[PDB]
Every structure is written in structure tokens, then in C-alpha cells.
């Protein structure tokens, strides 16, 4: 429970700050950072972002460049993110005033489809992108990440005939896995996509939706 005790205080700190704290899970290159660069563009979406890398501040200098402010951390070897790891990020956002002016921090964790499912971040909604190339029977493949998934979004869905990939797999898969939650197609060359998203994100802050996930 050492993750576990510092995630509880973790989301005690959210709370406290009015935030409602996502935590998206994928492979390396699924397209979070593209995602949430397009999320910057919905002023009714106000949020700052914790970057999780093992090097570089590549992520999160796309986001600043796009006016969010985001902090990146460098885990070096680590391949997941730890609740002990977003205290650093969270304190400098805060002194910064970042979390002031957010209804969401959002967390990008390190790529990687195994090991960020096994460590609670105290946040409200843990999503899961599987993109397209990456293939349509990833599900059962991992599925202690797709359990732990409050939605799954079907990121890249503009590729979805040139890989010949069944949304249906994918959907049938998720079915007996975790049933209750959510599948999103989702394309950066689909602004509608991207709205529906956030929409759906507004409201689950509204409901207050803290999932209930053991990690
Ligand atoms: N075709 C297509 N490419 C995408 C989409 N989203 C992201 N990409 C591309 O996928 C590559 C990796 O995306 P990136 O944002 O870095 O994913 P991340 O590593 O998970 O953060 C980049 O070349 C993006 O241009 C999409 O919806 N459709
Ligand atoms: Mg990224
Ligand atoms: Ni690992």
C-alpha cells in the first residue's frame, strides 16, 4: 500500500485544489500528446498536465508550445509513473499558479502498456488509448490495463481501413473485460471526435466521477 497510502494522500491534495485528475495509459506513441494538444484547443477545457518520461522534455514543450503549462518528469528507468512522483510535479504547478486556473490536471504516463496499471496515481478517471496500428486484438492481450480503463478511446481512428482493424474486436473484447466502460473512435483530423471527448470529460467532472479502481 506504499503507492497506495500516497496516492489516497495524493487525491486528498486534488481535491483540496478543486482538481479532477486524469490518468491516460497507452503505448508509446498512441498519440497522447497530440491528443491533449488538441484538448488546449477548447477554451471551455481548462487544464495543465504532468508529463511522464523516462528523458527528455519532448512531450512537454509540444504542450507549452501550445500554451499549456506542463511539467515534465523524467523517471530515467523507471517505465510507469508513481503517486510519490507526482508530489514534485503537483508542488511546482501549484507555486506556479497552474492549478489556480485548472477544473483538470491531467497525467500522461510513460508509454508502456503493463506496468502503469499496477500503480494508483489518486486519480479520478484512468483512460486507455489503443490506436489503430497497433492492432485490434491488444485487449486481451493486456488486459490488466483495459480492467483498469474508466473509458478506452480508439485513438488514429482516421486509419482504420488502411490497417483493416475491427472496431468490433475490439468492442467485443472490452465487453468481457470491463462491460461499463466507455469505447471513444478518436481522430486528430476529427475535431468532432475531440469535442465529444471533452464533453464527456466535462460532465464526469460535474458527476464528480472517482473511480473506484484497485490497483
Ligand atoms: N493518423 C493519425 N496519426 C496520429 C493521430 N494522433 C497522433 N498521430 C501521430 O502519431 C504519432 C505519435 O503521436 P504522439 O502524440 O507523439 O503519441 P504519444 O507518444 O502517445 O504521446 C505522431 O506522428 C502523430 O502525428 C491520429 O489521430 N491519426
Ligand atoms: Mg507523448
Ligand atoms: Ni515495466
Same mark, same amino acid.
Given at each position: 500500500s506504499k503507492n497506495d497510502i500516497k496516492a489516497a494522500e495524493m487525491k486528498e491534495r486534488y481535491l483540496k485544489?478543486?482538481?479532477?485528475?486524469?490518468?491516460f495509459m497507452s503505448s508509446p506513441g498512441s498519440g497522447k500528446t497530440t491528443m491533449l494538444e488538441?484538448?488546449?484547443?477548447?477554451?471551455?477545457?481548462?487544464?495543465?498536465?504532468?508529463?511522464?518520461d523516462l528523458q527528455t522534455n519532448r512531450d512537454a514543450d509540444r504542450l507549452?508550445?501550445?500554451?499549456?503549462?506542463?511539467?515534465? =518528469?523524467?523517471?530515467?528507468?523507471?517505465?510507469?509513473?508513481?503517486?510519490?512522483?507526482?508530489?514534485?510535479?503537483?508542488?511546482?504547478?501549484?507555486?506556479?499558479?497552474?492549478?489556480?486556473?485548472?477544473?483538470?490536471? =491531467?497525467?500522461?504516463?510513460?508509454?508502456?502498456?503493463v506496468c502503469p496499471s499496477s500503480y494508483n496515481l489518486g486519480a479520478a478517471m484512468n483512460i486507455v488509448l489503443?490506436?489503430?496500428?497497433?492492432?485490434?486484438?491488444?485487449?486481451?492481450?493486456?488486459?490488466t490495463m483495459f480492467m483498469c480503463?474508466?473509458?478506452?478511446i480508439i485513438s488514429k481512428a482516421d486509419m482504420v481501413e488502411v490497417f483493416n482493424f475491427r472496431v468490433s474486436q475490439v468492442k467485443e473484447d472490452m465487453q468481457k473485460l470491463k462491460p461499463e466502460a466507455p469505447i471513444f473512435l478518436m481522430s486528430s483530423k476529427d475535431?468532432?471526435?475531440?469535442?465529444?471527448?471533452?464533453?464527456?470529460?466535462?460532465?464526469?467532472?460535474?458527476?464528480?466521477?472517482?473511480?473506484?479502481?484497485?490497483?
Open positions: 485544489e478543486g482538481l479532477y485528475v486524469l490518468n488538441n484538448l488546449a484547443d477548447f477554451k471551455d477545457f481548462k487544464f495543465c498536465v504532468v508529463e511522464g507549452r508550445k501550445k500554451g499549456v503549462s506542463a511539467h515534465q =518528469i523524467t523517471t530515467g528507468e523507471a517505465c510507469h509513473l508513481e503517486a510519490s512522483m507526482i508530489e514534485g510535479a503537483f508542488d511546482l504547478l501549484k507555486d506556479e499558479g497552474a492549478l489556480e486556473k485548472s477544473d483538470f490536471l =491531467i497525467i500522461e504516463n510513460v508509454g508502456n502498456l489503443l490506436s489503430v496500428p497497433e492492432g485490434d486484438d491488444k485487449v486481451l492481450k493486456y488486459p480503463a474508466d473509458a478506452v475535431p468532432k471526435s475531440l469535442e465529444d471527448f471533452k464533453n464527456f470529460l466535462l460532465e464526469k467532472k460535474r458527476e464528480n466521477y472517482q473511480s473506484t479502481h484497485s490497483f
